[PDB]
Design a protein around this ligand. Sequence first.
Ligand SMILES: *SCCNC(=O)[C@H]1CCCN(C(=O)c2cc(Cl)c(O)c(Cl)c2)C1
Ligand SMILES: *SCCNC(=O)[C@H]1CCCN(C(=O)c2cc(Cl)c(O)c(Cl)c2)C1
Ligand SMILES: [Mg+2]
Ligand SMILES: [Mg+2]
Ligand SMILES: [Mg+2]
Ligand SMILES: [Mg+2]
Lengths: 236, 236, 10, 10
Amino acid sequence: GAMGSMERASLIQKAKLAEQAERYEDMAAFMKGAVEKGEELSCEERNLLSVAYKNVVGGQRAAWRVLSSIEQKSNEEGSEEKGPEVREYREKVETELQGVCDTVLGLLDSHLIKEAGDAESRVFYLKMKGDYYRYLAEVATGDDKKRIIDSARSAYQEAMDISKKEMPPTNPIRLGLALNFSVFHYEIANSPEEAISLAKTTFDEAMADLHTLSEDSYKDSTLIMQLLRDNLTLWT
Amino acid sequence: GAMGSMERASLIQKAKLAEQAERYEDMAAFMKGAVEKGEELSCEERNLLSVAYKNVVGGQRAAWRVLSSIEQKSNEEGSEEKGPEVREYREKVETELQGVCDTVLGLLDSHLIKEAGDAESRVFYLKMKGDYYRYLAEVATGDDKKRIIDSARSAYQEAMDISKKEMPPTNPIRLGLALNFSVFHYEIANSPEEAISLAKTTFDEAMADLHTLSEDSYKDSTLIMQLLRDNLTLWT
Amino acid sequence: PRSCTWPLPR
Amino acid sequence: PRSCTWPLPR
Ligand SMILES: *SCCNC(=O)[C@H]1CCCN(C(=O)c2cc(Cl)c(O)c(Cl)c2)C1
Ligand SMILES: *SCCNC(=O)[C@H]1CCCN(C(=O)c2cc(Cl)c(O)c(Cl)c2)C1
Ligand SMILES: [Mg+2]
Ligand SMILES: [Mg+2]
Ligand SMILES: [Mg+2]
Ligand SMILES: [Mg+2]
């Protein structure tokens, strides 16, 4: 890897600089290099990894949605034939997106998840695994779509089982996991009632635990809790 | 070039899709491929080329400024030694920026400018040449800085001379050229009075010609005229 | 609106 | 503010 000659600490330092500079592709490459050093990631380092790749894949997903919408309109009755270019370019962006997802899933499988013994780190990585299979599922159409969907479901479910056993209901990773698994149910699994049930139960159990928190923890938790409410408002 | 096998028309079609998708690196690569087909560019195609590379270099310049500011603070009295990483990463972004500028300047020199006989196209390309030498000058520090600055000045001046002879004072390319040359004077050449004089004269000569314009042309011209006024307000 | 997920890209 | 130039990136 091109980051193999750079010190781990220098890679983390540069990931933070890349974030400040809004250079998220660079950020992700620095954090991939850090992961490939083979040591476990600290809490802050996990956050850098997550933020980096979320921003990269976020741009790709937004572009894919623009192009897929154009492609869909091109295939409506009465639409002029424009040739293969829209499909080709949608496929180009899709393949790049799938590559990023495969890269993240590869870091998680080699070997972040297996070395993660603490509940917080294990849940963090399993949530990421669910998320990146979910992004693969958003673009999937072939023989493998059902298995991609079930890979997302399985990772999210394992994360949920651990987080319920080992973390308080206000834990921000637990909350973000439940938020994203609820969106998985709504958007990917065609299970809107499961999505709504999960969002509501997650919100109510967190509400009931806020009294235990410091002011700073209360801010972290209520920020994600508002996203659960926002989704419930969209969906009901 | 990787675009050598794609039809010119397909490259232009995909540049427009990339713009819609906010995929400006792709946009620029498609338009480079189109230029390398060797035919002159139409008005709309010139605009696509300009928008594509302006967005790419705009992100790089913003990142470079963030990193240069951090580097400057690191070199102030009392600042803790942090090692080479800030300089290294600033240099990385700088080298990438210089590469983009060199790529654009190479397209203009081979062979957009020499084949541009109409005043509108020639001025358009010479303004771009001034702009990308100006971006090189923003980061330049070595033996060549003065010559980079004079290359920007010389391209802008030739564009100005042609535009004054051949285009009305409200022409949007003429206006954008004068706007950017005025910023060159203020920011690069350490000539704020020249910058202010040029902005004011450009604004007043355009004001006096607005009566000749259609509503749509009036909108194009007054939009850039407002940027001249905005700069005059910042500078006075 | 698009459904919210976390973290949110800048 | 930073001085305005044209065109402006999105
Ligand atoms: S790492 C030092 C202490 N901070 C944290 O533990 C968490 C605290 C609460 C806020 N966080 C998140 O909400 C969060 C960030 C990221 Cl990058 C994620 O991917 C997820 Cl799921 C949650 C950081
Ligand atoms: S190409 C078809 C007609 N449109 C145009 O001629 C111009 C008209 C006025 C608005 N334009 C600009 O303001 C302009 C765009 C771009 Cl991409 C530039 O680089 C510059 Cl200098 C000016 C397009
Ligand atoms: Mg495909
Ligand atoms: Mg349940
Ligand atoms: Mg350098
Ligand atoms: Mg003069």
